[PDB]
Amino acid sequence: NSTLIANSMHNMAIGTLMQREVGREQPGVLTFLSEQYVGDDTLFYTKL
C-alpha cells in the first residue's frame, strides 16, 4: 500500500547522508539550494 512512500523516504534518508558527507569532506565547495525526491529519482539544485 505504500511502496512509493517507502522508496521515496528511503531516498530522502540517502540524500541526507550524501549532503552531510559532502559538507564534511569539502567545506564550502558545494551549497545545496533545493532537494526533491520522487519514486526512485532524486534532484538537487546547488551552487558550485
Binding site: 552531510r20 559538507g23 564534511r24 567545506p27
Partner: protein, 50 residues
C-alpha cells in the same frame, strides 16, 4: 581540571527552542563561582545570550 566548551557543527539541524531551554539549564547545572569553574568564559557568554 576539566573545562567545558561549545561545539559548532554546520551540518546539524535542530529546533531553535533547544538552545533557549539549554540556556536556562546551564545556569542551574554548572558553577562559575569565585573558587573554581566548570566552563570557559566563552561558553558562559553563549549561555547568557541564550
Amino acid at each position: 581540571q576539566i573545562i567545558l566548551d561549545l561545539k559548532i557543527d554546520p551540518g546539524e539541524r535542530m529546533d531553535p527552542a533547544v538552545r533557549m531551554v539549554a540556556g536556562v539549564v546551564g545556569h542551574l547545572l554548572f558553577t562559575a563561582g569565585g573558587r573554581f569553574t566548570n566552563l570557559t568564559q566563552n561558553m558562559a557568554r553563549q549561555l547568557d545570550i541564550a
